[PDB]
Amino acid sequence: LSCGQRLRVVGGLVALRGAHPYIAALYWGHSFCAGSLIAPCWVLTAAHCLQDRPAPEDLTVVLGQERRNHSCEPCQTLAVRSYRLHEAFSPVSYQHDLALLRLQEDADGSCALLSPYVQPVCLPSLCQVAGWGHQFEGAEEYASFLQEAQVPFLSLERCSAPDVHGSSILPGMLCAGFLEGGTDACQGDSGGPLVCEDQAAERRLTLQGIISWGSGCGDRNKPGVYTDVAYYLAWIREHTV
Template sequence: MKLLEPWKLALIALGIVLFMALVIGLLVYFLLFDKEIYFYNAAFTFTNIPYGPDLEKQTSKQFRDLSTGIETLVTRTFRDSSLDKKYIRSHVVKMRPDGSNGPRVVAEVVLMFHFASRDNIAALSERVKSLLFRQVQTTMGYLATDPSTFTLSETKKENGEHMLNNCCGMRTSKLPAYTDRVTGGTSAQDGAWPWQASLQLRGSHRCGATLISNTWLVTAAHCFRGQRDPSQWTASFGTVIQPPKSLRYIHNIIIHEQYADNPSNHNNDIALVQLSSPVEFTSEIRKVCLPEASQVFPHNTSCFVTGWGALEDNGECVNNLQQAEVRIIKTDICNREEVYNGVITPGMVCAGYLEGKVDACQGDSGGPLVTADTRQMWYLVGIVSWGDECAKKNKPGVYTRVTYYRDWIATKTGI
């Protein structure tokens, strides 16, 4: 038997490798990339839930509890079905009264699915509707529904995105599998923290801030020491300072009336910034959820602090937004002699680690400390305020406690 020459064998092997690479590439494309997001609007009427004004606010306990129950049930419906791999999520975007039949509650829900181009979209849409209708007809747990009022319709992608963009606390990118340090942090992905803003004095980054509506930011009062003229300030949005996703001039700056413009006094370190014109909410620019004044964030709650501040004490600010995971520390622990020796007041909250290594730093001031609830909605826990250097042992970051000033924010902004 005549053996093939080595160069012919090499060509055959190369051909096999190229063919396998093409097959694998096509498989990867069809499995991962040949998908499009489809949005649906659903409406459920609940007959055993009386409508009240608290259901108008997405951040109220009543709205959060009812939404959790609805979303959990909808998710379970699809997770236990043939659509499990195609279902992404559901989100309650609005509660309204059922005006025609007394004080009943109508919940409007956005559903998201991944369908491939080869899928029969019409048949899948009917499957989505039939699964939900069957659920409504049988049981929705403790929620009594009126099946005759159930509706479901496909909506354009831009309409679905618009509804989600206008909800507070929504993120578009997932956290990385690790975070080691803003001192001790990692660079944030686009859309990871869409409420983060950079406050810039005459074009230079000075502080962070948090978007709480399309026209209002909340930040730290100490950012404006000696510089309270709104015409000197701008706010930029996006994960990088240069070039920004969007830029706005400042119309008004409101400093807390009891804030003392004194470097040694950290009480009432909160300010509000009104933009000259509204921002347009997108997947990369959104508002955070403001907690109710009564909302409690227990000690050891996992939070994230973000900012463009220095990566080490007395370092330079960076252009890419940094993120770091920290945990809430009990006030009595933070007030120990070896920590902050009794200076932590009710309007402050400590977060970080007593061993140091992870912390906010210079340039992060005014930025957000946030945590997610069970619906993965992100709430503003604190505002970067002060600390003894950066990431120092027994010197965790100290933040302005947002719940303590929640009523003050509402008085000034109506939010």
């Protein structure tokens, strides 16, 4: 498939190489964030990851990772040429929590080299959250292997209820998970994906959300809040030329 091809977090299971070929790991200093390769030179992440404005030259993007800590011969390490946070991102409400990383092209104009293990994810036009974050709130360490968990969408009516997130859910956000708790994104999953298999398009992986924020991890009535990628389609297309 041109995009969304697939080869093979609290309450998740290990996601081996090729399960999320689009997932990107972003490193700088002692900080980390996840992202999604949406085109060979473009990675979509959360704006809150880059609030402190690290210099692009200090960033490293790694594609093809299974364990974050291992050196991996087929994995692709790329420099970041520049990045763009959404101009409306608010560090107080977390509205408009999205950012684009423009990967550094080589002498031949190439960034990510596509393979069975590295493939872009489709943009919108069943659902899982993935990441290397804490496997429970307060965990001393990030997960060693990439984790994946199946989480369903929650309507704006149910997520904006007073016992759930109330008035905190603003336009551009969506919720996914369970009101029962137990399965969700957690600290360290920032910027990562919420991908769905598009039944209408041969089950191709489609990026529906960006892991943004949560009140706890897997708590009852507190599902994870994601940036609604479909809400920003024109912004993404406008800034990825």
